[PDB]
Amino acid sequence: KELIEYFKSQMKEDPDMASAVAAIRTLLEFLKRDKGETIQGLRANLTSAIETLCGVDSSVAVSSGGELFLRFISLASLEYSDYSKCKKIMIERGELFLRRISLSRNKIADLCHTFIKDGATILTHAYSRVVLRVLEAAVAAKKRFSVYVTESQPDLSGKKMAKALCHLNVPVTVVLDAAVGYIMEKADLVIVGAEGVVENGGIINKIGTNQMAVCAKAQNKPFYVVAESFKFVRLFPLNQQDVPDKFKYHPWVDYTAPSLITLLFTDLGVLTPSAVSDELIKLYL
Amino acid sequence: PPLQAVLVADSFDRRFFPISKDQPRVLLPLANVALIDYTLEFLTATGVQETFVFCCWKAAQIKEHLLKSKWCRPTSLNVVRIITSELYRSLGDVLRDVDAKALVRSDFLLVYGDVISNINITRALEEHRLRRKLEKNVSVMTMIFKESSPSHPTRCHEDNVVVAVDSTTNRVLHFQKTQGLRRFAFPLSLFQGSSDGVEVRYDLLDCHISICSPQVAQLFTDNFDYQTRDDFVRGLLVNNQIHMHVTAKEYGARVSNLHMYSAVCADVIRRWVYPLTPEANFTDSTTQSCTHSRHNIYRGPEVSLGHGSILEENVL
Numbered sequence: 001k002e003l004i005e006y007f008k009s010q011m012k013e014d015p016d017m018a019s020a021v022a023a024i025r026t027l028l029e030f031l032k033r034d035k036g037e038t039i040q041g042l043r044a045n046l047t048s049a050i051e052t053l054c055g056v057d058s059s060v061a062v063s064s065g066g067e068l069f070l071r072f073i074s075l076a077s078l079e080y081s082d083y084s085k086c087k088k089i090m091i092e093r094g095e096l097f098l099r100r101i102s103l104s105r106n107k108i109a110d111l112c113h114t115f116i117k118d119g120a121t122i123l124t125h126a127y128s129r130v131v132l133r134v135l136e137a138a139v140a141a142k143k144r145f146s147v148y149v150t151e152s153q154p155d156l157s158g159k160k161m162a163k164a165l166c167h168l169n170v171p172v173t174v175v176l177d178a179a180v181g182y183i184m185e186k187a188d189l190v191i192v193g194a195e196g197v198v199e200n201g202g203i204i205n206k207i208g209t210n211q212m213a214v215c216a217k218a219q220n221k222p223f224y225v226v227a228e229s230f231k232f233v234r235l236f237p238l239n240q241q242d243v244p245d246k247f248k249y250h251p252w253v254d255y256t257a258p259s260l261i262t263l264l265f266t267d268l269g270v271l272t273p274s275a276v277s278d279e280l281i282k283l284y285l
Numbered sequence: 286p287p288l289q290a291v292l293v294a295d296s297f298d299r300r301f302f303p304i305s306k307d308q309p310r311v312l313l314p315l316a317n318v319a320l321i322d323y324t325l326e327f328l329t330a331t332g333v334q335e336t337f338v339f340c341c342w343k344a345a346q347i348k349e350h351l352l353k354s355k356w357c358r359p360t361s362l363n364v365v366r367i368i369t370s371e372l373y374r375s376l377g378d379v380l381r382d383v384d385a386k387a388l389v390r391s392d393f394l395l396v397y398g399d400v401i402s403n404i405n406i407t408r409a410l411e412e413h414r415l416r417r418k419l420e421k422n423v424s425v426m427t428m429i430f431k432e433s434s435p436s437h438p439t440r441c442h443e444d445n446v447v448v449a450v451d452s453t454t455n456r457v458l459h460f461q462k463t464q465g466l467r468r469f470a471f472p473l474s475l476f477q478g479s480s481d482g483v484e485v486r487y488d489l490l491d492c493h494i495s496i497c498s499p500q501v502a503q504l505f506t507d508n509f510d511y512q513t514r515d516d517f518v519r520g521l522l523v524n525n526q527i528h529m530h531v532t533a534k535e536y537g538a539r540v541s542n543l544h545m546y547s548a549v550c551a552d553v554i555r556r557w558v559y560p561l562t563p564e565a566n567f568t569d570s571t572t573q574s575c576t577h578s579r580h581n582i583y584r585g586p587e588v589s590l591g592h593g594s595i596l597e598e599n600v601l
Binding site: 142 | 589592
C-alpha cells in the first residue's frame with residue numbers, strides 16, 4: 001500500500017524524528033486522500049490505517065499518537081456534526097497541531113536543562129533524542145558535567161548514546177547493564193526519556209529502567225523523566241504483567257510506578273507524577 | 286533634628302605610599318568596590334540624612350566618582366556635599382573649617398572615608414542625646430568600639446588601643462595606644478571621684494566612628510595643636526566628658542594600612558559584614574553584579590571558567 005511506504009519514507013528522511021510524530025504526519029497526509037463524505041467511513045478508514053501502522057511498528061508512542069488523532073477528530077466532530085466544513089477545519093487544526101508538536105523537543109530541553117548543575121554526574125539508561133537535546137542545551141549553557149550511560153544489552157544503543165555525547169565534548173562513560181547499582185552512589189540525578197506515560201504517572205520505558213528507578217529510590221537520588229505530550233496513553237498497569245504484550249514484543253519494555261519518579265519535563269511544562277492524570281482527564285481520550 | 290555626618294575622604298597619613306601615588310586610598314577596590322562606597326552605604330543605612338565630603342588629595346577623581354555614584358542622584362535620601370580645598374593637612378584643619386563655615390548644627394558623626402561597618406547608631410545616638418539633655422553641655426563625644434579578642438587578625442598593632450573606662454556609666458577616663466609597647470601605664474587621676482566602677486578594657490576594636498557635637502569643633506578651633514581625633518581625646522582627658530559605646534553583634538573596621546586591608550577583605554567575602562556582601566550589589570551598578578554559591582564562591586557575568594580549574598574557598 002501507501003500507508004506503509006509513507007511511514008517508512010517519513011522515518012527515513014530524518015532518522016532523529018520519533019515514530020509517533022511520523023505516524024501523525026502520515027495520518028494527516030492520508031487524510032487528504034479521503035474521498036468518502038460520511039464520518040464513520042473516514043473514522044474506520046483512518047482507524048484501520050492507525051492499527052496497521054501500529055502493527056508495523058510495535059511501540060507505545062505510535063498507539064498514543066493514533067489515539068490522540070482520533071480524539072482530536074472526535075472533538076472536531078463535536079464541532080458541528082457536519083463533515084462538510086469539518087474536514088477542512090480539521091486539516092487546518094491538524095497542521096497547527098503538527099507545527100506545535102514539532103517544537104515540543106526544544107521546549108522540553110529549554111525547561112529541563114536548568115535542573116543540571118555544574119560538576120554534577122548524570123545517569124542515563126539508553127539513547128534518547130530528548131535527553132541528548134537536554135544535555136546539549138546544558139553544555140550550551142556554559143555548564144560542565146559527567147554522564148554515565150548503560151550499554152543497553154538488548155540492543156547496543158547505549159554505546160550510540162555515548163558516542164553522540166562524546167562528540168559534544170562531554171566526558172561520557174559507559175557502564176554495564178548489571179552495574180547500575182555500583183555507580184548509583186556516584187550519580188547526583190537521573191534523567192531518562194519515556195516511551196509512554198500511563199494514566200497514573202508511571203512510564204513505559206526500556207527493560208532496564210525500572211530497576212534503575214528502584215536503585216534511585218533506594219539511595220534518595222532524583223529520578224527525572226523527559227517525554228513529550230503525544231506519548232500520553234490511557235493505560236494503568238498494576239505490575240509488570242498488566243502491560244500489553246504487543247508493546248513488550250526477552251521483553252523490550254517495562255513499567256515504572258510514579259512513586260519512583262521525582263518530576264516530569266514535558267512540552268506542557270514541568271509537572272509532577274500526578275498532574276499527568278489531570279491532563280489525561282481533561283482530554284477525555 | 287535631621288541626622289548629619291562629615292566624611293573625610295582623605296586620610297592625612299601615607300602608609301599606602303606606593304599605591305596612593307596614582308590613585309587615592311579611598312578608591313582602592315576592596316571587593317571590586319571602593320571603600321568610600323562602603324562608608325556611604327553605612328551612613329545611608331544607619332539613618333544619616335546629609336553628609337559633608339571634604340577632600341584634599343586627588344579630589345578631582347573623588348568628586349567625579351561620587352558624581353557617577355548613586356548617592357548623588359536626586360532619588361537619594363542622603364544628600365552629599367563636596368567641599369574641596371588644598372590647604373587641609375590634618376583632621377584638625379577640617380574641623381576648624383567646619384566651625385568656620387557653620388555647617389553642622391547638632392550631634393553629627395565623624396567617620397573616615399575608608400570605614401566599612403554595618404553598625405546601627407540609633408541606640409548610641411539616643412543614649413548620647415539623653416545624656417546630653419541631663420548634662421546640657423557635658424558629654425561631648427562618643428567613640429564606637431567593637432568588642433573583639435586580642436588574638437583577632439583584624440586587630441593590628443598600629444591601631445591597637447587600651448582604655449580605662451567606668452563600668453557604672455560608660456565614660457572614658459584613660460585612652461592610649463599600644464603600638465610598640467609592652468607594659469602599660471595608667472595614671473592615678475582616674476581613681477579620684479568615685480573609685481568603685483573602674484575597669485581596664487583591652488578587648489576593643491577602634492571603628493574610628495565617633496558621635497561628635499558642634500562643641501567638639503568649637504574646641505578644635507580653641508586648641509590649635511589638635512591635629513587628629515586621638516589628640517583631641519588625650520587633651521580633653523588630661524583636663525567636658527567623652528563617652529563610648531561598645532557593640533557585640535555588629536561589624537565595624539577602618540582600613541588604615543595594607544594588613545588592615547587584607548583583614549576587612551576576608552571579613553567582607555566571608556559575609557561578616559552582612560548585609561554588605563558582593564552578592565547583594567549594594568552600589569546599584571551593572572558591572573558589579575555577582576551570584577553567591579556554595580562555599581562563598583562568587584561568580585560574576587561572563588566568567589569563562591576553564592575545564593579543570595577548582596574553586597575551593599571564598600573567591601570573588
